[PDB]
């Protein structure tokens, strides 16, 4: 997978993905649904957002989300 990502999904054709409108740093900070189903923005305001090809989960990445970086399977 992509160097320096700890999920490591590219986000297919038509692929959704979910933007925390309440934690993230701007709307290019995304978690694929796994992730974002077992994460605490599950709760918050958020966006989703089917991908057109291409972009990836930035589960993990501490500097992307205010607070809950790390989904379940990520913990
Ligand atoms: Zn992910
Ligand atoms: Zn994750
Ligand atoms: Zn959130």
Redesign the pocket.
């Known amino acids: 997978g992509p160097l320096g990502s700890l ?3 590219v986000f297919k054709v038509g692929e959704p993905t979910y933007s925390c409108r309440d934690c993230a740093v701007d709307p290019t900070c995304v ?2 649904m ?2 974002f189903l077992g994460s605490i923005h599950r709760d918050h305001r958020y966006r989703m957002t089917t991908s057109g090809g291409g972009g990836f ?1 930035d ?1 993990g990445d501490t500097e992307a989300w205010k607070e809950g970086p790390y ?1 379940q399977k ?1 913990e």
């Open positions: 999920c490591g999904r978690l694929c796994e992730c989960c589960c989904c990520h």
